[PDB]
Amino acid sequence: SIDEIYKYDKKQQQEILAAKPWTKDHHYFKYCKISALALLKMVMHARSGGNLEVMGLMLGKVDGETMIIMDSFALPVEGTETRVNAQAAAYEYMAAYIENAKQVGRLENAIGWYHSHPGYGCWLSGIDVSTQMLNQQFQEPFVAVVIDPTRTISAGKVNLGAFRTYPKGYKPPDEGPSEYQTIPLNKIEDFGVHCKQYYALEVSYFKSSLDRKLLELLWNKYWVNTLSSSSLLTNADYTTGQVFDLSEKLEQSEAQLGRGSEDKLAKATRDSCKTTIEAIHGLMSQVIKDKLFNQINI
Amino acid sequence: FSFKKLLDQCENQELEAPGGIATPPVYGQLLALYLLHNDMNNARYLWKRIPPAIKSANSELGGIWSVGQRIWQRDFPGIYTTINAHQWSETVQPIMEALRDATRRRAFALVSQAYTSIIADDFAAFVGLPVEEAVKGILEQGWQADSTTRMVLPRKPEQQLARLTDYVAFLEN
Amino acid sequence: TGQNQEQFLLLAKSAKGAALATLIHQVLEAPGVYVFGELLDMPNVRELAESDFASTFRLLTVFAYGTYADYLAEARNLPPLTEAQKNKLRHLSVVTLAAKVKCIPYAVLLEALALRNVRQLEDLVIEAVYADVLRGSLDQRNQRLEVDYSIGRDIQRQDLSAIARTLQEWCVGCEVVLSGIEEQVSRANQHKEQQLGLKQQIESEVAN
Amino acid sequence: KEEQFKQVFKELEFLGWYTTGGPPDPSDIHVHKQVCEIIESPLFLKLNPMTKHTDLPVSVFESVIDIINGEATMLFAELTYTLATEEAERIGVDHVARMTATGSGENSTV
Numbered sequence: 001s002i003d004e005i006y007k008y009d010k011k012q013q014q015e016i017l018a019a020k021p022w023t024k025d026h027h028y029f030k031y032c033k034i035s036a037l038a039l040l041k042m043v044m045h046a047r048s049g050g051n052l053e054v055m056g057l058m059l060g061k062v063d064g065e066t067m068i069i070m071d072s073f074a075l076p077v078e079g080t081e082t083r084v085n086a087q088a089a090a091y092e093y094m095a096a097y098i099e100n101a102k103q104v105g106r107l108e109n110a111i112g113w114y115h116s117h118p119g120y121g122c123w124l125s126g127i128d129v130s131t132q133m134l135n136q137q138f139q140e141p142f143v144a145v146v147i148d149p150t151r152t153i154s155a156g157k158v159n160l161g162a163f164r165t166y167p168k169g170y171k172p173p174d175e176g177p178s179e180y181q182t183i184p185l186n187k188i189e190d191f192g193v194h195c196k197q198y199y200a201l202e203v204s205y206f207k208s209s210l211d212r213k214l215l216e217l218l219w220n221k222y223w224v225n226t227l228s229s230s231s232l233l234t235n236a237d238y239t240t241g242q243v244f245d246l247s248e249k250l251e252q253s254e255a256q257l258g259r260g261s262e263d264k265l266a267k268a269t270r271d272s273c274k275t276t277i278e279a280i281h282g283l284m285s286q287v288i289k290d291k292l293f294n295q296i297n298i
Numbered sequence: 299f300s301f302k303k304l305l306d307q308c309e310n311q312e313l314e315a316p317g318g319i320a321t322p323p324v325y326g327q328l329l330a331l332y333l334l335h336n337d338m339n340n341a342r343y344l345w346k347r348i349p350p351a352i353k354s355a356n357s358e359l360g361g362i363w364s365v366g367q368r369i370w371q372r373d374f375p376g377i378y379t380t381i382n383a384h385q386w387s388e389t390v391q392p393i394m395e396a397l398r399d400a401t402r403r404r405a406f407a408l409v410s411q412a413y414t415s416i417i418a419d420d421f422a423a424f425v426g427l428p429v430e431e432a433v434k435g436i437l438e439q440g441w442q443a444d445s446t447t448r449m450v451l452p453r454k455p456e457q458q459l460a461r462l463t464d465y466v467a468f469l470e471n
Numbered sequence: 472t473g474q475n476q477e478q479f480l481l482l483a484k485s486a487k488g489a490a491l492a493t494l495i496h497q498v499l500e501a502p503g504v505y506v507f508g509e510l511l512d513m514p515n516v517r518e519l520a521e522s523d524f525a526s527t528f529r530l531l532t533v534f535a536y537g538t539y540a541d542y543l544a545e546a547r548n549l550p551p552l553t554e555a556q557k558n559k560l561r562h563l564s565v566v567t568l569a570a571k572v573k574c575i576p577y578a579v580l581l582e583a584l585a586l587r588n589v590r591q592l593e594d595l596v597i598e599a600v601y602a603d604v605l606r607g608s609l610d611q612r613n614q615r616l617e618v619d620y621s622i623g624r625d626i627q628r629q630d631l632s633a634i635a636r637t638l639q640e641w642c643v644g645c646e647v648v649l650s651g652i653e654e655q656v657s658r659a660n661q662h663k664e665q666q667l668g669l670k671q672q673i674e675s676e677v678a679n
Numbered sequence: 680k681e682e683q684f685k686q687v688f689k690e691l692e693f694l695g696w697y698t699t700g701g702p703p704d705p706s707d708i709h710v711h712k713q714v715c716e717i718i719e720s721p722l723f724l725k726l727n728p729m730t731k732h733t734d735l736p737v738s739v740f741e742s743v744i745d746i747i748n749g750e751a752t753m754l755f756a757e758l759t760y761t762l763a764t765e766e767a768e769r770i771g772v773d774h775v776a777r778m779t780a781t782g783s784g785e786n787s788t789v
């Protein structure tokens with residue numbers, strides 16, 4: 001039975017809460033299972049606001065080293081990324097939402113907070129790290145999630161991240177590859193400083209029996225939306241912007257060759273591909289359609 | 299149509315067969331074929347390579363070079379005068395008739411895009427035909443025509459995915 | 472249509488020759504009923520064909536197959552029509568032109584419908600879309616009539632192969648792309664395994 | 680909850696309600712009356728969880744009222760539903776309905 005996870009054992013939670021394998025090992029939690037609903041609503045919350053970062057709250061539970069996220073919702077706050085802990089404005093709508101939600105079915109407890117990062121990867125800024133450190137300080141099992149809606153679109157797949165911060169004192173172990181994503185230079189500094197102070201979590205996605213069976217029945221009529229998709233005028237103001245970012249990254253490495261952070265043409269080359277790889281992939285689905293619907297004759 | 303594949307053969311026999319100097323009829327066709335495919339630079343330096351021996355003996359070759367002068371000068375009525383002059387049958391007379399046709403549609407495709415309005419008499423001589431045949435030839439096309447002033451008014455005239463996937467995989471590495 | 476081929480098909484079986492000579496003028500001149508698959512293909516009406524009630528029979532074929540140009544050609548061999556029936560034909564005569572040619576110039580619709588001006592044309596086209604026959608819009612300066620969707624009037628068992636062949640070319644097209652993808656997908660992975668293999672040969676040179 | 684949903688999605692409006700089970704029935708008509716006190720055009724979705732349909736078991740309805748032999752009374756007129764298109768959302772569907780559970784080794788991209 002797939003619905004092993006949509007079950008919620010409440011007494012098991014409060015035994016782990018008391019036991020605490022997180023006060024013993026600093027990097028205990030390493031995995032993160034994201035539900036069907038949780039993914040959709042978080043992606044929907046990020047894009048709905050769009051250009052502006054907005055954060056909400058996640059609900060979930062713990063199991064082994066996996067911090068499972070079951071359900072999510074929004075926090076009507078402002079100044080995400082510009083304020084350290086911007087959720088303080090609506091302390092009312094955190095507890096008041098879970099008090100209402102527990103009457104109707106959502107028994108799940110506070111598991112974390114998520115925010116959107118439109119057009120610049122998934123990572124924790126210096127403002128985000130100060131939020132999460134103090135979140136872990138008091139309100140324990142709390143995981144900071146990030147999603148990039150504008151690139152999720154252009155890249156053509158779920159652009160998402162799940163992170164946890166380390167203590168101010170103890171410093172991380174060695175094993176860390178960490179994959180590269182284009183960071184706009186305006187932000188590269190902020191990232192660059194506080195980037196090594198935290199560690200990510202291995203993301204995995206699950207679903208129920210009904211969800212799985214519904215999505216299969218849903219696909220009978222959803223193939224139509226795939227071949228009238230067109231990721232061009234949808235996210236037009238990411239690709240047109242990335243150019244502005246790309247231009248600056250070259251401008252630096254050009255003068256770097258001259259008189260005068262290690263070969264910033266190798267980054268810019270990867271960015272020029274990254275951004276254009278998308279632009280080309282876009283025109284694949286376009287010609288695919290011109291082939292299909294236009295070329296039948298009468 | 300097939301003059302292309304045949305011109306190739308002439309150019310080869312220039313360096314192929316002879317110790318230096320090619321056949322006199324082979325010179326007569328190489329000059330006229332360069333004019334057919336409007337290559338006046340090639341036609342100019344071909345004429346200067348000919349030895350004075352074949353030049354003087356083969357006086358019909360001069361009649362073909364007299365055509366090339368008018369293409370360089372762009373005296374279009376002069377071209378049609380010099381095409382209707384020397385009968386060099388078998389060898390050159392077939393490619394002389396094709397030469398007059400390529401020069402005609404050049405001067406039509408030219409005049410069409412070079413003139414909003416133009417004199418019928420000039421237009422006639424520029425393409426070669428007389429006043430009537432010129433006035434008629436255009437009225438079939440639907441070109442506007444003007445009496446009194448005699449002014450013709452010209453009307454101006456996987457495959458794809460394979461290419462794309464490469465430009466991805468290239469930039470992708 | 473749907474209700475008036477159950478109300479008017481219950482009365483198409485239980486009706487003699489003169490009862491159908493009246494009923495043919497009722498079903499035609501009644502907006503909503505633009506389909507004529509059933510009413511023409513009925514044993515009852517087929518006896519009228521080439522009989523004393525032959526004028527009313529030829530008329531049911533025009534609305535269920537032909538166009539307005541055909542009506543004006545057969546103006547005496549058919550019974551005289553009123554404007555409300557002439558309009559319903561002027562709707563269906565475009566629907567045919569619409570299935571073939573999706574971008575229609577204005578002047579076209581003065582010829583196939585024998586109409587006098589845009590004002591009318593438009594008005595008639597208004598009613599066309601208004602009766603839920605067509606979808607689309609117009610382009611006044613450009614003199615156009617784009618047609619986003621049109622219903623199909625005829626069934627045509629005569630030219631059911633003309634429907635089948637157009638379907639095959641799309642089924643072919645489906646394969647054209649499907650296989651066309653799988654080639655390019657297998658090649659984009661092959662060019663990745665081309666480079667990944669060739670980049671292991673570049674690094675192993677350094678071991679010397 | 681009308682407070683809290685007006686806070687987060689300030690643009691959004693109240694439209695209707697949902698439930699699970701069979702097709703429309705008396706127990707939902709009584710509930711539809713209680714939603715009719717709140718708004719003048721309440722929509723109604725009903726979902727069959729353990730459906731026998733090979734098609735989707737989610738149908739949308741609305742309130743309609745006619746003379747049932749000298750009796751004005753409420754009914755359900757069924758309506759159809761086109762699916763949503765949002766590009767950001769579409770990927771969410773494409774991710775959970777089609778999961779990369781160890782199904783891509785060499786990047787490939789295409």
Ligand SMILES: [Zn+2]
Pocket residue numbers: 081115116117123124125128146
């Ligand atoms: Zn952030």
